[PDB]
Enzyme design. Structure first.
Site, short mmCIF file in Angstrom:
data_model
loop_
_atom_site.label_atom_id
_atom_site.label_comp_id
_atom_site.label_asym_id
_atom_site.label_seq_id
_atom_site.Cartn_x
_atom_site.Cartn_y
_atom_site.Cartn_z
N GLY A 1 0.83 -1.20 0.00
CA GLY A 1 0.00 0.00 0.00
C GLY A 1 0.86 1.24 0.00
O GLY A 1 1.93 1.24 0.60
N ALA B 1 0.91 3.87 1.67
CA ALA B 1 1.33 4.13 3.04
C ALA B 1 2.41 3.16 3.51
O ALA B 1 3.51 3.57 3.84
CB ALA B 1 0.15 4.06 3.95
N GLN C 1 5.43 4.27 2.17
CA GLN C 1 5.97 5.54 2.65
C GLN C 1 6.65 5.25 3.99
O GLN C 1 7.79 5.66 4.24
CB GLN C 1 4.84 6.56 2.87
CG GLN C 1 3.84 6.65 1.71
CD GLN C 1 2.87 7.82 1.85
OE1 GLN C 1 3.29 8.98 1.82
NE2 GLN C 1 1.59 7.53 1.97
N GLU D 1 -0.95 1.95 -7.90
CA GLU D 1 -0.55 3.18 -8.61
C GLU D 1 0.98 3.35 -8.53
O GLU D 1 1.59 3.08 -7.50
CB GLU D 1 -1.31 4.41 -8.06
CG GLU D 1 -1.08 4.78 -6.58
CD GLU D 1 -1.96 5.96 -6.03
OE1 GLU D 1 -2.53 6.75 -6.84
OE2 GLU D 1 -2.05 6.13 -4.77
N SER E 1 -1.43 -0.59 5.55
CA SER E 1 -2.28 0.43 6.14
C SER E 1 -3.76 0.12 6.22
O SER E 1 -4.58 0.77 5.57
CB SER E 1 -2.10 1.73 5.37
OG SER E 1 -0.74 2.09 5.39
N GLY F 1 -7.07 0.86 3.42
CA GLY F 1 -6.75 1.33 2.08
C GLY F 1 -7.29 0.33 1.09
O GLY F 1 -8.08 -0.55 1.45
N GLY G 1 -3.65 -1.68 0.45
CA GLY G 1 -3.16 -2.08 1.75
C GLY G 1 -4.01 -3.07 2.53
O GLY G 1 -3.50 -3.96 3.22
N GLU H 1 10.20 -15.26 19.62
CA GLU H 1 10.09 -14.78 21.00
C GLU H 1 8.83 -13.96 21.18
O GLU H 1 8.02 -14.23 22.07
CB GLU H 1 11.28 -13.90 21.36
CG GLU H 1 12.61 -14.60 21.34
CD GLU H 1 13.20 -14.75 22.72
OE1 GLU H 1 13.09 -13.80 23.52
OE2 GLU H 1 13.79 -15.82 23.00
N1 LIG Z 1 1.73 6.82 9.41
C1 LIG Z 1 1.36 6.94 8.17
N2 LIG Z 1 0.09 6.74 7.82
C2 LIG Z 1 -0.13 6.91 6.47
C3 LIG Z 1 0.80 7.26 5.49
N3 LIG Z 1 0.21 7.34 4.25
C4 LIG Z 1 -1.05 7.06 4.47
N4 LIG Z 1 -1.32 6.78 5.79
C5 LIG Z 1 -2.63 6.42 6.37
O1 LIG Z 1 -3.07 5.21 5.74
C6 LIG Z 1 -4.40 5.40 5.19
C7 LIG Z 1 -4.33 5.73 3.74
O2 LIG Z 1 -4.31 4.62 2.85
P1 LIG Z 1 -4.24 5.08 1.27
O3 LIG Z 1 -3.02 5.86 1.00
O4 LIG Z 1 -5.53 5.75 0.96
O5 LIG Z 1 -4.23 3.75 0.52
P2 LIG Z 1 -3.24 2.59 0.35
O6 LIG Z 1 -3.48 1.74 1.59
O7 LIG Z 1 -1.89 3.04 0.07
O8 LIG Z 1 -3.84 1.71 -0.91
P3 LIG Z 1 -4.84 2.13 -1.87
O9 LIG Z 1 -6.29 2.55 -1.37
O10 LIG Z 1 -5.30 1.17 -3.08
O11 LIG Z 1 -4.30 3.46 -2.62
C8 LIG Z 1 -4.99 6.59 5.92
O12 LIG Z 1 -5.60 6.16 7.12
C9 LIG Z 1 -3.75 7.45 6.15
O13 LIG Z 1 -3.96 8.28 7.30
C10 LIG Z 1 2.12 7.47 5.88
O14 LIG Z 1 3.06 7.78 5.14
N5 LIG Z 1 2.34 7.28 7.26
#
Ligand SMILES: Nc1nc2c(ncn2[C@@H]2O[C@H](COP(=O)(O)OP(=O)(O)OP(=O)(O)O)[C@@H](O)[C@H]2O)c(=O)[nH]1
Ligand SMILES: Nc1nc2c(ncn2[C@@H]2O[C@H](COP(=O)(O)OP(=O)(O)O)[C@@H](O)[C@H]2O)c(=O)[nH]1
EC number: 3.6.5.-
Lengths: 429, 309, 426
Positions: free
Chosen positions: A9, A11, A14, A61, A130, A133, A136, A244
Site C-alpha cells: 500500500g 502508506a 511511505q 498506482e 495500512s 486502504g 493495503g 520470541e
Molecule cells: N503513518 C502513516 N500513515 C499513512 C501514510 N500514508 C497514508 N497513511 C494512512 O493510511 C491510510 C491511507 O491509505 P491510502 O493511502 O488511501 O491507501 P493505500 O493503503 O496506500 O492503498 P490504496 O487505497 O489502493 O491506494 C490513511 O488512514 C492514512 O492516514 C504514511 O506515510 N504514514
C-alpha cells in the site's frame, strides 16, 4: 535468522521508505548500498560491495513507488523488488483483494519466495500495510493469506497503521479495515499496531509541532520499528528473537494485535537538556499519552508487554524499574497472568535522523503489548462499519468487484467474536 | 397498496440423497416448528420451512396456489426460486414438466388455470398469452425467438412496463404451454458451450398473462404472473432484487426498481398490490453452510419477525 | 493511466478551448510546441491527455463534436486551436438545430459512428485507459442530445473505464435559450444512467462567484469558462501528480458515490481572490477550507447550506501538513454536523497532491456531492411540466422523429432522481 518484509500500500511503502531509511542510517550503509552476520537478518550481501534490500514493495498506482526510484535510496533496492500494477488502486478492499489485486499477487509472491530462498534459515516476514486502504487492506489480505499456507512454519508479524479514531481519511475506511482484519486474522502471528492520529498527539504534546508531515509519523514508526527487528536481531545483553514475540506476546491464536510505544519522544532543540532517567522512561511507558495508538488504557488490562530497551541499561535498573511498576496496581495486569514482562536488552543506543526533530538520547524503551484496551479501538471501528453497511453505502463498489453480501456480513460476524474475545480474555477472573 | 410488501418467503431444503448419505455428508439443518430452521445454532424463521421430503404438491399448495387465484382474480404476482446452484430452483419451478408427481410449480399453475377456465366457460371469455425470456449479463434474450437479443424495457402509455419486441404467444391448452416451455428450453441451448454454467447464470422468466371478459358483466380482468428461476446466488439482478425487497419490507414509498432490467419489468407485479412468494432453496449439505446463511439473509430483507436486540 | 476529453456541442467546445488553454500551461505545452515545462514533473504523467508522434508535438487527446461548423472553426482558427489533429474534429455541417431531438435521433445519430470511430482510435492509443472527460451544455442540440448520445455509446463500449461529465445545467434567473428544460431534462436523463461522475456548473453561479469573489466587472464568457476549466484541472490532471495522499478518478468516484445513480457534484476552487489587492495570501489552509466550504463559491446554483452532503473531496494541490489538512476537515465536519449527513462517519475525502497550480502557492479543488442539488433538478423539472403541459415547442422535437412518451420518460426519470436525493437529506 532473518525476517523478510513486504511493504504493501502507498502508506506501507511511505512508512517503508522511512523505516528503511532509519536502517542504513544506523548501519553505516550510504544510499549507495555500500558500508565501510550481525544484521544480515535484514540485508543480503549481494557480493560484492553492496547491500540491497531484504524486502519488497507492492502498490497498484506507480506514483509512490516511483518516488523511491528518484530520491537517493534509488540506489538501495534492486530495480526488481519494487512490484507495481500500473492499473488502478481503488480505495476499496474487494477490488484490491479480489478483482485487480489478484493479477499481481502471483508475481508478488514470487519475490517473497525468490527472496525467501536466497537467504539462510529465515524466521518470517515483517509485513507493512495500512489497514484502511485499497492496496493495503485488500491485497495483503490475500498476500498474508497465501503466506500462511506457503510457510505456515514461520512468523507472520504484520505491522499495521489502523484507522485514526476520528481523523480517518477514506470515506469507506471501515469497510476496508473490517475486511483486512477478518481475512488476515487467521493468518498472522502478531500484528503490531500504530495509530496514525494518536501519533500526532505525540507530535503536538511530546515534541511540539503543528507541522507534522507524513514524513514524520513515518520517522517515528520508522523508530519504534527499528527497535523491533533491526537492533533486536542484533546481538545484545538479552536478545529477543521474532518468534520470541508471538510466544511471549500472544496469549491466543487470534493474530493478536499489541500496540507500539516508544519512550524518549523529545524534540531536537530540546537536544541539550539533561537526559531522562531509566525510571522516567520506564514510567513514560505507562502513560496512555505516548503510545502511538488512540487506545488509552481506558480499562484494557495489559496481558503481556515486551519491553525492548536499547543503549546503556543495567539489567538491575530494569529488573527494578519494572518491579516498581508491577506494584503500581493502577496499571492492573490480567489475572491469569502472574508476570507478563519480556525484558529485551540491546546494546547500541537508538539512532536519530541527523536533523529531523527526534531528541537523540542514549537509551530508549520500545515497549509493545497486548492490552484488553483494543476492546475499544475495535469496537469503535466496528460500529462505524455497521452504520454504513446498515445502508449499504458504498457497497455497490465492492460487489461489482467480485465480493458479496457474504464477505461483508460474514466478516462482520467475524470481528464480532473479536469484541467478545478481547472481552473474555480479560475483565474476568 | 393492500398490505404493502405482500412478500412471503418459504425455505425449501432439498431431499437427502443416497449419494450424499453414502458420502457421509455432514449436517447443516435442524428443524423447529413449521417455520424455523436452525443453522449454526441460529434460528431463521420464514413463512414456512419445507424439509427434504416435501412433495411438489406441498410446495405448490403453500407457495403458488393462492397466487394463481389472485391472477384469475385479476391481480399480478411474482414467484421466485432463489438459491445456490444445485439448490433445487429448477426442480421447484419446473420439475418434470410432464410427470404428474414430479412436475414443479409452473406445470401445476398451468394446469390450475385451464381447469378453472374449463369450469367457468359460462360468459367469461379468456385469453392467455405467454412469454419466455432470459436475462444474462443484464441483457434480455427472447427464448421464443433467438433473433431477439438484447431487448430493452419500455413503459407504455399507462406506465405498464414491457419488453420491447418480446414474443407473446397465445396458448389454448396446457399442452401448448408445455410445448412453449420446451421450445424455450431448446432455444436456450444453442450457442451455449456449457448449459450448466449458462443455466445457473441466466435468470429464466416465464410470464403468464390471463385476461378475461365477462360478456354479461363486461368487467374485464387482466393478471400477469411472472415465474422466475433466478441465477445462482453463489449478480446485478440479485442485488437489485435485494434492494427492492428490502425497500418494500421497510415500507418505503420509493422502491429501487430501476436498479435492474429485471426489477423494472417486474415492477407492476412486484410489491404494491401484488402477492409475491420467494422460495429460497438450500442444500442441507455440509460445505455451504455459508451460502444458505446468505440465502436466508436475503429472504430476511422482507419483513419477518424482528428479534429483540 | 489515461483519459480522453470530449468537447460536445459549442459550449462544451468553447470550454474545450479554455480547458486546454489552461491544462497545457499546467503542462508546458505551447500551441504546437512541446514541453517547455518550467519543471520536469509536468511531464512524467502528461500521457493522461496527450500522444507521442513527432517529439515536440504532444497532441491533446480529446474529441470535438459539433453540428455547427462556425464554432469548431472559431476554436480551430484562434489561439491553441492549431494543436488538435484534424482527425479530432468530428463536425456535422448539417443544421445544428437547437433541438435535443435533432442532435440525438436525427442529425447527430448519423455523425455518431464517425465519432465512435475516433473515440476508439484514441482509446486504443496506448497504455491503460481510465475514463473520458465530457464537456457540454444541457441546453441545446449538439450539447445535450448528441453529446448525451456519445456517452450512451461510450458506456456500452467500455463499461469499465469511468465517465466524468461536466454539464452546464440551465442557469435559473435567466435562460440563455427557450426550450432549455426540454434539451436539459432529456440530457440529465441520459446522464443519470451512463456517466458516473458529473460536475454541474451554472453560468450565473459563476457570474456571481466571478463578479463578487473577483471584483471582476466585465466577466466575459472566456472568463467563466476559464474559472470552470480551473476546477476540472484540479480534479483530473492534478491527481495524476504525486502527493502525500493522492487519489485518481476512481478514488474520487469510489469515495463519492454512495448510490449508483451516478450523482452529480458541485466543484469549487480554493484561492479565489481578486488580482492586485486581495492578494492577501491568507492561504495558510484554514483559509482554503474557509473558501471551498462557504455557500457562494460553489459553481453550482444551489447553496449547500440548503441540504446535507453525502461526500466531499477536497483535492488540495500544494505543500501542506497532512495534519493541518486532516485536522481542519474535522472541525469543519463538526461545526456543520447539521448539514453533512450522519450515516457516513467521515463524509470528507481528503486528497493531497504536491505541486500546485503553476503560479500559485496553495490551492484545493472541491467536489461536493450534496443533497442540495435536489433543488436544481427540481427547477429544471418544473420548467418542463409548466411547458410540457402545453407541448410548447414540442413540434420541433416530434417533427424530428421523437416520441410523446420520450419526454414523459425523461422528466419522470430525472424527476424521480430528485426524489431519491431527498432520501438522504432525511
Ligand atoms: N503513518 C502513516 N500513515 C499513512 C501514510 N500514508 C497514508 N497513511 C494512512 O493510511 C491510510 C491511507 O491509505 P491510502 O493511502 O488511501 O491507501 P493505500 O493503503 O496506500 O492503498 P490504496 O487505497 O489502493 O491506494 C490513511 O488512514 C492514512 O492516514 C504514511 O506515510 N504514514
Ligand atoms: N460557461 C459557458 N456556457 C456557455 C458557453 N456557450 C454557450 N454556453 C451556455 O450553453 C447554453 C446554450 O447551449 P449551446 O452551447 O449553444 O448548445 P449547442 O451549441 O446547440 O450544443 C446556454 O445556457 C449558455 O449560457 C460558454 O462558452 N461557456
Amino acid at each position: 535468522r532473518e525476517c523478510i518484509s513486504i511493504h504493501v500500500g502507498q502508506a506501507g511503502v511511505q512508512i517503508g521508505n522511512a523505516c528503511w531509511e532509519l536502517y542504513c542510517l544506523e548501519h553505516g550503509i550510504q544510499p549507495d548500498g555500500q558500508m565501510p552476520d550481525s544484521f544480515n537478518t535484514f540485508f543480503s550481501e549481494t557480493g560484492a560491495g553492496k547491500h540491497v534490500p531484504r524486502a519488497v514493495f507492492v502498490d497498484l498506482e506507480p506514483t509512490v513507488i516511483d518516488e523511491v526510484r528518484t530520491g537517493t535510496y534509488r540506489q538501495l533496492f534492486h530495480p526488481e523488488q519494487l512490484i507495481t500494477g500500473k492499473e488502478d488502486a481503488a480505495n476499496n478492499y474487494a477490488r484490491g483483494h479480489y478483482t485487480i489485486g489478484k493479477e499481481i499477487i502471483d508475481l508478488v509472491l514470487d519475490r517473497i519466495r525468490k527472496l525467501a530462498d536466497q537467504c539462510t534459515g529465515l524466521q518470517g516476514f515483517s509485513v507493512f500495510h495500512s489497514f484502511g486502504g485499497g492496496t493495503g487492506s485488500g491485497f495483503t489480505s490475500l498476500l498474508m493469506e497465501r503466506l500462511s499456507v506457503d510457510y505456515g512454519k514461520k512468523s507472520k508479524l504484520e505491522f499495521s497503521i489502523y484507522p485514526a479514531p476520528q481523523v480517518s481519511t477514506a470515506v469507506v475506511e471501515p469497510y476496508n479495515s473490517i475486511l483486512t482484519t477478518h481475512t488476515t486474522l487467521e493468518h498472522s502471528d502478531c500484528a503490531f499496531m500504530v495509530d496514525n492520529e494518536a501519533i500526532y498527539d505525540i507530535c503536538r504534546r511530546n515534541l511540539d509541532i503543528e507541522r507534522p508531515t507524513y514524513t514524520n509519523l513515518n520517522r517515528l514508526i520508522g523508530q519504534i520499528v527499528s527497535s523491533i527487528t533491526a537492533s533486536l536481531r542484533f546481538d545484545g545483553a538479552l536478545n529477543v528473537d521474532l518468534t520470541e514475540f508471538q510466544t511471549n506476546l500472544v496469549p491466543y491464536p487470534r493474530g493478536h494485535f499489541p500496540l507500539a510505544t516508544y519512550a524518549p519522544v523529545i524534540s531536537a532543540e530540546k537536544a541539550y537538556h539533561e537526559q531522562l532517567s531509566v525510571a522516567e522512561i520506564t514510567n513514560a511507558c505507562f502513560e496512555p499519552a505516548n503510545q502511538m495508538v488512540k487506545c488509552d488504557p481506558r480499562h484494557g488490562k495489559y496481558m503481556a508487554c515486551c519491553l525492548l530497551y536499547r543503549g546503556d541499561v543495567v539489567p538491575k535498573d530494569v529488573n527494578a524499574a519494572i518491579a516498581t511498576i508491577k506494584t503500581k496496581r493502577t496499571i492492573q495486569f490480567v489475572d491469569w497472568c502472574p508476570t507478563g514482562f519480556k525484558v529485551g536488552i540491546n546494546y547500541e543506543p537508538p539512532t536519530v535522523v541527523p536533523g529531523g526533530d527526534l531528541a537523540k538520547v542514549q537509551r530508549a524503551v520500545c515497549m509493545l503489548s497486548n492490552t484488553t484496551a483494543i476492546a475499544e479501538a475495535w469496537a469503535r471501528l466496528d460500529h462505524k462499519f455497521d452504520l454504513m453497511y446498515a445502508k449499504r453505502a458504498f457497497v455497490h463498489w465492492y460487489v461489482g468487484e467480485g465480493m458479496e453480501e457474504g464477505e461483508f456480513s460474514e466478516a462482520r460476524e467475524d470481528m464480532a467474536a473479536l469484541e467478545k474475545d478481547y472481552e473474555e480474555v480479560g475483565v474476568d477472573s | 397498496d393492500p398490505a404493502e410488501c405482500n412478500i412471503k418467503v418459504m425455505c425449501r431444503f432439498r431431499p437427502l440423497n443416497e449419494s450424499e448419505v453414502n458420502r457421509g455428508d455432514k449436517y447443516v439443518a435442524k428443524f423447529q416448528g413449521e417455520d424455523t430452521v436452525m443453522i449454526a445454532s441460529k434460528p431463521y424463521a420464514f413463512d414456512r420451512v419445507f424439509q427434504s421430503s416435501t412433495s411438489q404438491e406441498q410446495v405448490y399448495n403453500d407457495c403458488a396456489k393462492k397466487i394463481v387465484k389472485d391472477v384469475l382474480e385479476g391481480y399480478n404476482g411474482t414467484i421466485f426460486a432463489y438459491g445456490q446452484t444445485s439448490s433445487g430452483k429448477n426442480h421447484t419451478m419446473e420439475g418434470k414438466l410432464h410427470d404428474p408427481e414430479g412436475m414443479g410449480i409452473i406445470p401445476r399453475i398451468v394446469q390450475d388455470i385451464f381447469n378453472y377456465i374449463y369450469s367457468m366457460d359460462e360468459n367469461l371469455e379468456f385469453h392467455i398469452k405467454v412469454s419466455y425470456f432470459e436475462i444474462y449479463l443484464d441483457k434480455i434474450r427472447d427464448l421464443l425467438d433467438v433473433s431477439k437479443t438484447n431487448l430493452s424495457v419500455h413503459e407504455d402509455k399507462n406506465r405498464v412496463p414491457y419488453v420491447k419486441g418480446c414474443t407473446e404467444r397465445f396458448v389454448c391448452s396446457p399442452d401448448e404451454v408445455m410445448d412453449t416451455i420446451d421450445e424455450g428450453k431448446s432455444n436456450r441451448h444453442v450457442a451455449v458451450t456449457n448449459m450448466n454454467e449458462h443455466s445457473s447464470r441466466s435468470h429464466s422468466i416465464f410470464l403468464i398473462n390471463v385476461k378475461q371478459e365477462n360478456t354479461q358483466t363486461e368487467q374485464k380482468l387482466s393478471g400477469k404472473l411472472y415465474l422466475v428461476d433466478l441465477a445462482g446466488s453463489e449478480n446485478k439482478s440479485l442485488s437489485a432484487l435485494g434492494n427492492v425487497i428490502s425497500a418494500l419490507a421497510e415500507g418505503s414509498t420509493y422502491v429501487p426498481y430501476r436498479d435492474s432490467k429485471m426489477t423494472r419489468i417486474l415492477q407492476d407485479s412486484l410489491g404494491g398490490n401484488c402477492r409475491t412468494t420467494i422460495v429460497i432453496c438450500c442444500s442441507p449439505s455440509s460445505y455451504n453452510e455459508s451460502e444458505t446463511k446468505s440465502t436466508l439473509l436475503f429472504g430476511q430483507r422482507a419483513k419477518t419477525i424482528k428479534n429483540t436486540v | 493511466r489515461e483519459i480522453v476529453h470530449i468537447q460536445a456541442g459549442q459550449c462544451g467546445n468553447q470550454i474545450g478551448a479554455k480547458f486546454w488553454e489552461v491544462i497545457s500551461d499546467e503542462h508546458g505545452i505551447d500551441p504546437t510546441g512541446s514541453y517547455h515545462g518550467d519543471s520536469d514533473l509536468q511531464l512524467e504523467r502528461i500521457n493522461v491527455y496527450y500522444n507521442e508522434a513527432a517529439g515536440n508535438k504532444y497532441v491533446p487527446r480529446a474529441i470535438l463534436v459539433d453540428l455547427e461548423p462556425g464554432t469548431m472553426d472559431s476554436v480551430r482558427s484562434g489561439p491553441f486551436g492549431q494543436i488538435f489533429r484534424p482527425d479530432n474534429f468530428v463536425f456535422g455541417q448539417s443544421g445544428a438545430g437547437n433541438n435535443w431531438a435533432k442532435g440525438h435521433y436525427t442529425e447527430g445519430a448519423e455523425l455518431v459512428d464517425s465519432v465512435l470511430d475516433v473515440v476508439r482510435k484514441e482509446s486504443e492509443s496506448c497504455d491503460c485507459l481510465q475514463g473520458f472527460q465530457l464537456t457540454h451544455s444541457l441546453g441545446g442540440g449538439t450539447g445535450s442530445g448528441m453529446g448525451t448520445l456519445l456517452i450512451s455509446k461510450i458506456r456500452e463500449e467500455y463499461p469499465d473505464r469511468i465517465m466524468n461529465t461536466f454539464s452546464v445545467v440551465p442557469s435559473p434567473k435567466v435562460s440563455d435559450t427557450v426550450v432549455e428544460p426540454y434539451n436539459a431534462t432529456l440530457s440529465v436523463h441520459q446522464l443519470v444512467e451512463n456517466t458516473d461522475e458529473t460536475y454541474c456548473i451554472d453560468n450565473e453561479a459563476l457570474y456571481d462567484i466571478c463578479f463578487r469573489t473577483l471584483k471582476l466587472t466585465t466577466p466575459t464568457y472566456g472568463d467563466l469558462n476559464h474559472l470552470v476549466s480551473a476546477t476540472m484541472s484540479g480534479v483530473t490532471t492534478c491527481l495524476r501528480f504525486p502527493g502525500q495522499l493522492n487519489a485518481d478518478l476512481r478514488k474520487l468516484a469510489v469515495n463519492m458515490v454512495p448510490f449508483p445513480r451516478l450523482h452529480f457534484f458541485m466543484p469549487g476552487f480554493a484561492p479565489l481572490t481578486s488580482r492586485g489587492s486581495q492578494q492577501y495570501r491568507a492561504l495558510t489552509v484554514p483559509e482554503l477550507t474557509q473558501q471551498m466550504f462557504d455557500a457562494k463559491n460553489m459553481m453550482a446554483a444551489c447553496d449547500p447550506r440548503h441540504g446535507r452532503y453525502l461526500t466531499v473531496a477536497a483535492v488540495f494541490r500544494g505543500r501542506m501538513s497532512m495534519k493541518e489538512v486532516d485536522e481542519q476537515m474535522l472541525n469543519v465536519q463538526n461545526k456543520n454536523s447539521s448539514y453533512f449527513v450522519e450515516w457516513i462517519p467521515n463524509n470528507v475525502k481528503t486528497a493531497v497532491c504536491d505541486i500546485p497550480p503553476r503560479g500559485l502557492k496553495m490551492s484545493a479543488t472541491f467536489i461536493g456531492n450534496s443533497t442540495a442539488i435536489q433543488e436544481l433538478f427540481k427547477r429544471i423539472s418544473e420548467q418542463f411540466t409548466a411547458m410540457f403541459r402545453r407541448k410548447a415547442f414540442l413540434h420541433w422535437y416530434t417533427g424530428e422523429g421523437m416520441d410523446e412518451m420520450e419526454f414523459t420518460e425523461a422528466e419522470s426519470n430525472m424527476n424521480d432522481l430528485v426524489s431519491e436525493y431527498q432520501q438522504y437529506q432525511d
